[PDB]
Every structure is written in C-alpha cells, then in structure tokens.
C-alpha cells in the first residue's frame, strides 16, 4: 500500500535562557522511529523503533549533525521573526516546521509537502507542485523572496523525490515485520442506559494498526483515535436497529458489522 | 560567457540622484537574482539589495531603505539602481553581482565609481623639487592625473604616490623618480583631462 | 545581523607557502551559504569558493575551503604571484547579507631600511619627507618643529608593494602655512634603521 515519511520540528524560544527548546520527531506512517531533544543528555539523535537500530554509527552520526543544523536555523529564524514583527525580546515564541514525502502502491514518489508556522499560525508552505511557496503575510512574502533567490524549492524538490523516497523504501524494508504488517482491530460492544427511554451503545475498536479507521452508524459521538502506548491505536463510537456498527479497517478483508447481543 | 556591463563613472553634486545600469548577457536573465553591492574607499563590501528579474520583487538592506531603489527590464536584460538624496558619504564604487542558482555571488560587474562633491573642476599646480627629483601636483579635481617622466624614458624608480583628498576637497599627488649620484648633469608629464593642461617642467637646484 | 570577522588584517607570506585565512561568524551559518571572494586592488571581486568548500568555475585547484558553524577557513596550497590580494568572506544566509572586513596578503621579503630624502618647500607648498624602498610598511614619520613632536599636521601616502622588490614608498608631506613655517627654526622610526633619522 501507500506509505509516508514525515519529520516534525518545534523550537520554543525562552528569553533569558540562551538556546531555544528544540524538539524533533520522525515518522514512518503512524510509527515514530527517531527523536531529538536539545535538553537531553545524549545530545544526539536517538532511535524510537526497534527496526531503525539496525543502522550503524555512520547513520546516527550524520543524522545527529543534520538535526543540530535544523536547530541552528530555527534559532536564527526566531531572532529574525522577532524583528519581522517587531516583538519584545522578553516574550516567548514558537516556530514549527513539518515536511515529508509519500509513496504509492508501487513505492514510487506520489506527493511531497512542507509547512512552516510561527506562534501556531500558518507562515509559509510549499505548494503541491513543489515549485512555489504560499506566503501568509508580508513577512512571509519577504521570506518567499529570500527562498526564491537561492532556489530552495528546487533543492527541497530533489530531496522529497529522491533521498526521502529511497530511505523510505529502506525503512519499510528493514521494518518489514512491523511497518508492513497490519493489525486488525479487536472488537467488543458495551451497553449503557442514559435516559428513561433511550440508551447508549458504544462500539469499541482497540489495538489496530495503522491508525486510520472509520466507525459510523449509517442507514452519534466518536472521539479521536488515541494511542494505546504499545504501537497500536484505540477508538470508539457511540450512538443514543436501523443502523449497526460498521467497522472498516485496512487489516480487515471484509468490514465488520456487530450488533448488541 | 556571463558578462555584466555597468555604467560609467559619475560626478554629481549633493542632493542629486544618479541611476546606474547593469547590462547582463551570456545567460538566462530571468534564472538568477541580481544583487547590488557598495564599496567605499579603503572599506569592505556592503550588500544593498537584490531584485527578482521576473516580477521586479525586491529586498533591501535596512540602511538603504530610502537611499537606493532597484528596477529591472526583462527586454534589454538590464538591472538598474537609482541612488537618491546623494551626500558625500554615498561616494563609493557600486557593483552588480549575480546571485548563483543556489547561492553566492558568482559573477560581478566591472564596477561604477560615484563621486558626490560640490566642486566642478580645478587645475593642477606643479611644484618641482630638487635637492631624486620630484613633480608635486597640488589642488586638482577630479580624479585622475597621469604623471610621467621624460615622456616615458625614465621609468626605473618611478614612485608615483596615490592621490590624497585634502581638507579643501581637492586631490594632490606626487611623482618621484630616483637618479644616481653621478647625475648632476643628466621632464614631468602631468596630464588632467578636465583641466586641459599638460604642465611639463624641469628640476634643477 | 550576522557579523563576519576575519583574522588577521594583513598576512605577510612568501611565494610558495600555504595561507590559512579565518572568518569568524557571530552566529551559526549554514555552510551552504558561506562564500570566499578575492579582489585585486583596482579590479572587481571574484568568487573563489562557494558552499564553504566548492570551488568556483575557473578557480585554480590550489584554492580550498572548509569550516562549519562559526569557524570557516580558506586555504591556498601554494602562494602564486596573483594570489597576493585582498580576500573577503560573506554570508547569504540571513538578511542583511554581510561581508567581512577583508585580509590583505603581503609579499614577505627582508627588513630593508628606508632611504629618507628631505625636500624643502618649493616656489613658483610644504615639506616632503620621502622614504624609498622600505620593508615592512610599518614606518613612523614623526615631524619635529624646534625639537618638539607634531601630531595631525602631515598628509601621508603609501604606494603599493613593488611587484619586483616587495618594497614600499611613503610621501609624508608636513603641511604648514608660509607664515608659521618662517617662525620656526622628520624622524623616521622604521624597523630597518636603529636611530630616528633627521635632516
């Protein structure tokens, strides 16, 4: 099926405390495999999945230097964005960056993306054509002009279509027994009385992978897909016999229909 | 071959405005951003700003916001910079440096010297010296002054010092050539284009 | 604004030696947006090394660059006659793009003492104290007026380094008025000499 590698970055400036708090995480589909924390003691990229630990020290050395360069750029960005908007030097601010590449069923390049935010608001983003930037305001238009000067979109386009995809195939291959093995949701139903005439039936979906799943009572109330803590996911949908629990997941050859009994 | 042809030098009065042109050739003009750099006498370089030759978008150094303005013309592949409200501190050499596709300034123009002064044109005043001889030029404007000796028949030891700007706003150089001790019995060739004078003299104690 | 600082200001070396030039950045700069430039006095700058290490088109193989973070280095394998000029570093990594103060490469020769030549004023002026073919450039022309030091009264001018003997020439002209000069009745401190000459 389709797969994706995504990287998330967060740098929170702290006035009077020197270096901003830089945190980075990497994902392969709904699985985190690398992390970095500027406040950690190792001061290097650390694995977060068993299969990624098959890489020698040469891999972790280059990834540690590259993630430290990302923090060095976000540090200058926070200082520049403070001047672009003319903000106080005693206030805290946040910059967030995310990018990644997706592949299809043939494991060839499908789409890429890159977004940047400041204080939780959209700042600049790469368009789907991977050749133009969408600027939010005048400060972002200055940045778009700055990036169009050195053709940053051309260099990022070459990474998403080449290096990002090739290493995604290597991650899927080395993580074959986990990244390519779907987990079917273990299903059970619960019944409760909430009114003098109406009741509530809650359909549970637990311990499934990937995270995407659809639960509806078609011819309601459902919460967000939450992590169980062991790599799997959880979700439930409730309603207060014209509609039953329709469970649809990639790990099920046919959808599951359950009714109270 | 990438060739950036700039405009010629310009001597202007304070409070005026000048416009420098930069002709690009040998490459795709719309594929590279065009930058502008100023260098004062005895000083280093300062980035003024850049301009996107496709849509005319510009960015400026904060110091030059209101001093220089960048424009382009995709037809003639020419980049322009207009410097307004000129003062004596604006007198420097201005370059147009092409931005590399992924960074740096890969190609530079030959430069355009700008001079901002209230003076128009002065005339040299040769004061010979003889105890090596000497041909001291004094109180001239503007640059330059070509100082030769013996019409070129004496170039061994010809130390022609670079001109110095005086407190009066005029330049002054001194051309000195060394002669041996057995030279008790052995002509300056100063030239100034705006002065229309070629003061040829001699040196004898 | 990221400030670029070069060290030293002037570097005296001989043809055929290595040259290591330093450029310290006040803030962390991506090596992909650091560059070196050479400028011969009279000409325009020329790109030598882009991307902290990539050699530009046409630059001889004797030029090599390296560095990262806040420390970058330009290396010249063998100093050739053309490789004696001013070298600048810059960053195009954060607006405004900034350059360094520069570093001049001077030909190293031998401590040649100056030949002072006193010249009294002319007539048709000031007094000129010419030093000829002295190395190093570091010379002190202190003027005396009735056995007293003078400050802020002499217009000086140094020529370029001789392209054959690696020497300099200075024209220290003690400016004065025709009236004050007739009311009173140089001292070279160069490394070559051992006593302040006066005449």
């Amino acid at each position: 099926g389709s797969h994706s590698m995504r990287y998330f970055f967060t740098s929170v400036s702290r006035p009077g405390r020197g270096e901003p708090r830089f945190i980075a995480v990497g994902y392969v589909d709904d699985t985190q495999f690398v992390r970095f924390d500027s406040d950690a003691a190792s001061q290097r990229m650390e694995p977060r999945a068993p299969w990624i630990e098959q890489e020698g020290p040469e891999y972790w050395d280059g990834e540690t230097r590259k993630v430290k360069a990302h923090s060095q750029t976000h540090r200058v960005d926070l200082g520049t964005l403070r001047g672009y908007y003319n903000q106080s030097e005693a206030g805290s601010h946040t910059v967030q960056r995310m990018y990644g590449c997706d592949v299809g069923s043939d494991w060839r390049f499908l789409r890429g993306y890159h977004q940047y935010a400041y204080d939780g608001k959209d700042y600049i983003a790469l368009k789907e054509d991977l050749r133009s930037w969408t600027a939010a305001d005048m400060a972002a238009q200055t940045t778009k002009h700055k990036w169009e000067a050195a053709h940053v979109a051309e260099q990022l386009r070459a990474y998403l279509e080449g290096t990002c995809v090739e290493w995604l195939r290597r991650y899927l291959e080395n993580g074959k027994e986990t990244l390519q093995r779907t987990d079917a949701p273990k299903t059970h139903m619960t019944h409760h009385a909430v009114s003098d005439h109406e009741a509530t039936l809650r359909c549970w979906a637990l311990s499934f992978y990937p995270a995407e799943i659809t639960l509806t009572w078609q011819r309601t109330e459902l919460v967000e897909t939450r992590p169980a803590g062991d790599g799997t996911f959880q979700k439930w949908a409730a309603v207060v016999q014209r509609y039953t629990c329709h469970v649809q997941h990639e790990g099920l050859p046919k959808p599951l229909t359950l009714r109270w009994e | 071959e990438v060739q950036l042809q700039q405009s010629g030098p310009e001597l202007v009065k304070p409070g005026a405005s000048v416009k420098i042109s930069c002709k690009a050739s040998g490459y795709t003009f719309t594929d590279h951003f065009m930058n502008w750099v100023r260098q004062s006498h005895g000083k280093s370089l300062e980035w003024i700003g850049d301009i996107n030759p496709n849509n005319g978008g510009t960015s400026y150094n904060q110091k030059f916001k209101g001093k220089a303005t960048l424009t382009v013309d995709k037809s003639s592949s020419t980049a322009f910079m207009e410097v307004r409200s000129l003062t004596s501190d604006d007198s420097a050499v201005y370059y147009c440096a092409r931005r590399g596709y992924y960074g740096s300034f890969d190609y530079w123009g030959q430069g355009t010297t700008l001079t901002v002064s209230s003076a128009s044109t002065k005339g040299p005043s040769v004061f010979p010296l003889a105890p090596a001889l000497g041909c001291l030029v004094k109180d001239y404007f503007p640059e330059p002054v070509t100082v030769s000796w013996n019409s070129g028949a004496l170039t061994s030891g010809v130390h022609t010092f670079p001109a110095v700007l005086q407190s009066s706003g005029l330049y002054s150089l001194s051309s000195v050539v060394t002669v041996p001790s057995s030279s008790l019995g052995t002509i300056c060739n100063v030239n100034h284009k705006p002065s229309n004078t070629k003061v040829d003299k001699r040196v004898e104690p | 604004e990221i400030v670029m600082t070069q060290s030293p200001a002037t570097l005296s070396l001989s043809p055929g030696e290595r040259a290591t030039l330093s450029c310290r950045a006040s803030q962390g700069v991506s090596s992909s947006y650091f560059s070196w430039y050479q400028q011969t006095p009279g000409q325009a700058p020329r790109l030598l090394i882009s991307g902290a290490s990539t050699r530009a088109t046409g630059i001889p193989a004797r030029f090599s660059g390296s560095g990262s973070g806040t420390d970058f280095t330009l290396t010249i394998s063998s100093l050739q006659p053309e490789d004696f000029a001013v070298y600048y570093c810059q960053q195009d990594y954060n607006l405004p793009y900034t350059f360094g103060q520069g570093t001049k490469l001077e030909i190293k020769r031998t401590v040649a003492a100056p030949s002072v030549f006193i010249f009294p004023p002319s007539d048709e002026a000031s007094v000129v104290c010419l030093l000829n073919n002295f190395y190093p450039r570091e010379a002190k022309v202190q003027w005396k007026v009735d056995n007293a030091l003078q400050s802020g009264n002499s217009q000086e001018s140094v020529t370029e380094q001789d392209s054959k003997d690696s020497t300099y020439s200075l024209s220290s002209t003690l400016t004065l008025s025709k009236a004050d000069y007739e009311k009173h009745k140089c001292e070279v401190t160069h490394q070559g000499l051992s006593s302040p000459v006066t005449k």
Partner: peptide, 10 residues
C-alpha cells in the same frame, strides 16, 4: 534520513 542543510534562514 534528514535532508541537507540547504534551507537558509527566514
């Protein structure tokens, strides 16, 4: 596998 340091500042 993180990309190279080709992104400049803002």
């Amino acid at each position: 596998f993180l990309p190279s340091d080709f992104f400049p500042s803002i």
